[PDB]
Structure formats: C-alpha cells, structure tokens
mmCIF file of C-alpha atoms (C1' of nucleotides) in Angstrom:
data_model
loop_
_atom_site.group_PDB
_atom_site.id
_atom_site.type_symbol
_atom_site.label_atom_id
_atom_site.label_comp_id
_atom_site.label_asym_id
_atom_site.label_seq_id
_atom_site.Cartn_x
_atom_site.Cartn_y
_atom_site.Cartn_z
ATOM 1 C CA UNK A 220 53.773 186.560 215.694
ATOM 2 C CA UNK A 221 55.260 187.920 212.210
ATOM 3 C CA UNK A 222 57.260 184.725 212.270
ATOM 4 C CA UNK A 223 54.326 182.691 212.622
ATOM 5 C CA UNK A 224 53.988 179.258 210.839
ATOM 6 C CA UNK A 225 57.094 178.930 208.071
ATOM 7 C CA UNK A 226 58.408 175.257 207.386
ATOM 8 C CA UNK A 227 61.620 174.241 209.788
ATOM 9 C CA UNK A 228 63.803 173.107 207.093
ATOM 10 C CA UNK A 229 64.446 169.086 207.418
ATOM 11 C CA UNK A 230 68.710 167.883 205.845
ATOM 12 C CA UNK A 231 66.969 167.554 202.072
ATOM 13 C CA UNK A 232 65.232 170.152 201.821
ATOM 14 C CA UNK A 233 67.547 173.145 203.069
ATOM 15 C CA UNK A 234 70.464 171.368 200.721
ATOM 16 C CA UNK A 235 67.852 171.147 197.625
ATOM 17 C CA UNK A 236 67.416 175.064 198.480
ATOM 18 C CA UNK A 237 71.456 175.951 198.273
ATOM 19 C CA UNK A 238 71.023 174.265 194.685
ATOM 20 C CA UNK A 239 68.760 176.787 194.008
ATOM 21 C CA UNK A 240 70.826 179.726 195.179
ATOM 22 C CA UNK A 241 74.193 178.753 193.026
ATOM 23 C CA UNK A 242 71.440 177.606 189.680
ATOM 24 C CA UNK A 243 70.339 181.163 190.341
ATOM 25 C CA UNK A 244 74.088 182.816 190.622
ATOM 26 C CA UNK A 245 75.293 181.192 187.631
ATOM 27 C CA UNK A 246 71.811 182.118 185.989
ATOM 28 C CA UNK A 247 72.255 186.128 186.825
ATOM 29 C CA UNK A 248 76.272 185.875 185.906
ATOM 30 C CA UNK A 249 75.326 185.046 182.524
ATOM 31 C CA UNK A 250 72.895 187.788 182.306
ATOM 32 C CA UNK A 251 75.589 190.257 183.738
ATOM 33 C CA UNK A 252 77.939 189.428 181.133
ATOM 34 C CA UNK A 253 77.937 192.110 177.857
ATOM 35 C CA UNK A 254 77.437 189.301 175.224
ATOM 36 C CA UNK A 255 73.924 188.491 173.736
ATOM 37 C CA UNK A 256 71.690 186.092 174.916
ATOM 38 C CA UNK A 257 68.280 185.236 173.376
ATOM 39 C CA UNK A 258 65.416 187.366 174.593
ATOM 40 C CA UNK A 259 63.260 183.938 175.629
ATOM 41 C CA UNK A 260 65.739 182.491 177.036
ATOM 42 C CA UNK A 261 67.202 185.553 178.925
ATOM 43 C CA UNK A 262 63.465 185.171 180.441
ATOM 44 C CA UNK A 263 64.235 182.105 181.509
ATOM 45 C CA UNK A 264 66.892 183.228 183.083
ATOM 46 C CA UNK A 265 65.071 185.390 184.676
ATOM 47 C CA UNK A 266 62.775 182.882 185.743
ATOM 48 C CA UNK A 267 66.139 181.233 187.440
ATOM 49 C CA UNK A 268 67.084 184.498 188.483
ATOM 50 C CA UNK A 269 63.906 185.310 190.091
ATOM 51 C CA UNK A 270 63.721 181.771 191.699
ATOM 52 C CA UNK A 271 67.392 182.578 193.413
ATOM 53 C CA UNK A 272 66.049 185.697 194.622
ATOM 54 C CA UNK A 273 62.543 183.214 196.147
ATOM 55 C CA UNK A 274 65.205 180.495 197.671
ATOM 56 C CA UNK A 275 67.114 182.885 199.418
ATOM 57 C CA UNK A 276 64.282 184.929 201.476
ATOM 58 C CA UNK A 277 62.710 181.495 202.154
ATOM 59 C CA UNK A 278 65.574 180.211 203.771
ATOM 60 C CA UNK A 279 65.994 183.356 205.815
ATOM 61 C CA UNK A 280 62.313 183.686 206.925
ATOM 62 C CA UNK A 281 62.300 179.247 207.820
ATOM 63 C CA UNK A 282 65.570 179.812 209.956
ATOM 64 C CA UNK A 283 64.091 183.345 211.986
ATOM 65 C CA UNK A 284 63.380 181.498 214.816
ATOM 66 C CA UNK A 285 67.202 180.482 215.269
ATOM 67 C CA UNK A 286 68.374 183.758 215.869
ATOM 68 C CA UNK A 287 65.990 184.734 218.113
ATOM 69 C CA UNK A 288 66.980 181.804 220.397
ATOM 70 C CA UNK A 289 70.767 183.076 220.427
ATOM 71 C CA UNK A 290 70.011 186.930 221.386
ATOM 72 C CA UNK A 291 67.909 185.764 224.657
ATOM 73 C CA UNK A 292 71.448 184.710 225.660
ATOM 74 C "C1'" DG B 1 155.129 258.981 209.968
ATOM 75 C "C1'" DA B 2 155.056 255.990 214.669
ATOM 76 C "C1'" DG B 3 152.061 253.137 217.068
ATOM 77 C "C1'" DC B 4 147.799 252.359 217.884
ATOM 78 C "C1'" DG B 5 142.594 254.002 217.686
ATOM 79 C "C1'" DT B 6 137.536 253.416 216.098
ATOM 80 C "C1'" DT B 7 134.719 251.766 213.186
ATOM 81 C "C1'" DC B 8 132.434 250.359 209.014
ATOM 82 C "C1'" DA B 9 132.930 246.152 205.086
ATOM 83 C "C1'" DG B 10 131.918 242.485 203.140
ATOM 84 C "C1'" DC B 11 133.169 237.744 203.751
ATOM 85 C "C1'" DG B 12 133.601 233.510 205.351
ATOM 86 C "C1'" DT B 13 132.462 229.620 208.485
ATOM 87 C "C1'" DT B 14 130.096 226.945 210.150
ATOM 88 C "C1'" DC B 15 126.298 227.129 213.436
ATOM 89 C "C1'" DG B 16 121.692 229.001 213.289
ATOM 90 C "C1'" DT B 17 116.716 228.327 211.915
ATOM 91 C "C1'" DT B 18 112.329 225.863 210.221
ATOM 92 C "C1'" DT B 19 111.373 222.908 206.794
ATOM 93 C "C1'" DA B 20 111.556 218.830 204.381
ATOM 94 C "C1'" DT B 21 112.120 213.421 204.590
ATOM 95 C "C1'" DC B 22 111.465 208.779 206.683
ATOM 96 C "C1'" DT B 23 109.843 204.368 210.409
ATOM 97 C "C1'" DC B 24 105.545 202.363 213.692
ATOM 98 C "C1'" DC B 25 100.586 200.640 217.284
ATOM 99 C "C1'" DC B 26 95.945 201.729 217.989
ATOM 100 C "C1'" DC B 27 91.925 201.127 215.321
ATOM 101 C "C1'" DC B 28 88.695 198.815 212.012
ATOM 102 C "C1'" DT B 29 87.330 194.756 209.440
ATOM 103 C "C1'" DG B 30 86.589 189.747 208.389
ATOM 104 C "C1'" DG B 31 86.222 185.098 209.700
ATOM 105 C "C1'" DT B 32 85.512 180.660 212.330
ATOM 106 C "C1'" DA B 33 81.541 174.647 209.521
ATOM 107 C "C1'" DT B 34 78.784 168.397 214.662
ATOM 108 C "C1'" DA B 35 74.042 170.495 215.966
ATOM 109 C "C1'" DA B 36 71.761 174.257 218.051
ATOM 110 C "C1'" DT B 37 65.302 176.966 215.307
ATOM 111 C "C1'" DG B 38 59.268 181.865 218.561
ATOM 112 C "C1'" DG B 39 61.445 186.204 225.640
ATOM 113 C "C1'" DG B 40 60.866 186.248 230.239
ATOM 114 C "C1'" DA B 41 58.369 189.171 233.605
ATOM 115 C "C1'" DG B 42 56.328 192.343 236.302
ATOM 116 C "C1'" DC B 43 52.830 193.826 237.715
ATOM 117 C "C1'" DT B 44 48.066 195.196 241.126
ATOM 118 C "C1'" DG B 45 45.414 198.547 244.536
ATOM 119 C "C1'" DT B 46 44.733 207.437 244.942
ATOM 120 C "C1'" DC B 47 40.636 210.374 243.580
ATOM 121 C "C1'" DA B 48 37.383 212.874 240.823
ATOM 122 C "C1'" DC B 49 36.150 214.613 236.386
ATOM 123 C "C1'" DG B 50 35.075 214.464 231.771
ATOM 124 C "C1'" DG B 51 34.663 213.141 227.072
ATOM 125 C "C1'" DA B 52 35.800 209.941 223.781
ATOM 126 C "C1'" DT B 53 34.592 205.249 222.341
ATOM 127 C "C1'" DG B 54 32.605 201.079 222.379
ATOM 128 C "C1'" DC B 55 28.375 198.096 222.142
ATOM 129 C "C1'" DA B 56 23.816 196.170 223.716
#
DNA sequence: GAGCGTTCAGCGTTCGTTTATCTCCCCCTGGTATAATGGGAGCTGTCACGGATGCA
C-alpha cells in the first residue's frame, strides 16, 4: 500500500532523471571544494544540489515495485 | 718417588634449548548492462465469562 500510485518511469523520462543526478554531482563537487563561490550562486547550487538529492529518491520510490517482483522468487 | 687413584676445575665443543624469522588458503568484498516494475495463502467450526469498545 506504501508504494501506492508513483509514475512507472517510460525510456525519456528515467534518462532525463540520470541528467539530473550527475547536474547535481558536479553541482555539490563544486561546493565541496575549499575555494569561494558566491553566496547566491552557492544557493543555486544548492538548489541543484537539493534537486540531485529529489531525482534520486524519485527514481528509487518509481522503481519499488521491481524489487518486490524479484524477492517472491 | 712409582704407578695409579679420586675428584674438583674451568674450558671447550658443539649439541642443547626456546626464541626469533619467513612463505600460504580460507574468508570477505565487489561486480556483472536486452528487458524484466505491488505475495500467495490458509484458514473455519470448544465453552463460558466478563469487560472493554463500538455504535444505533
């Protein structure tokens, strides 16, 4: 039931969401380095960051129902 | 003294010791790239008693 309705993830839209994962890598590198960034932009980084962090538990919660087919076995 | 008689002696002389090196399989971890996307499943009937808990 907790799975419950989450979009199944069509060729497009699961690749569009791996873009957002490695935007959101290089985003949180950049903020891990020592140099000085801007404090609006590091917010936008953030924002990048942030939106990483969204695109990763959304493709884990749409693709839930795949594992569960593999442990009946 | 002759000739050999007992018995410390400390000294070698390597053999005694325990102690130091050094080479190897179980055991643990990581990784596979077509696509694969919400369970089976086992029940059920004793009996009375009471008090909580729901609902007209």
């Amino acid at each position: 039931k907790q799975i419950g309705k989450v979009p199944l993830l069509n060729a497009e839209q699961e690749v569009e969401l791996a873009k957002r994962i490695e935007a959101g890598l290089f985003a949180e590198d950049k903020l891990a380095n020592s140099d000085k960034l801007a404090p609006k932009l590091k917010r936008e980084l953030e924002i990048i960051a942030e939106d990483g962090r969204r695109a990763k538990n959304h493709l884990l919660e749409a693709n839930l129902r795949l594992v569960v087919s593999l442990a009946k076995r």
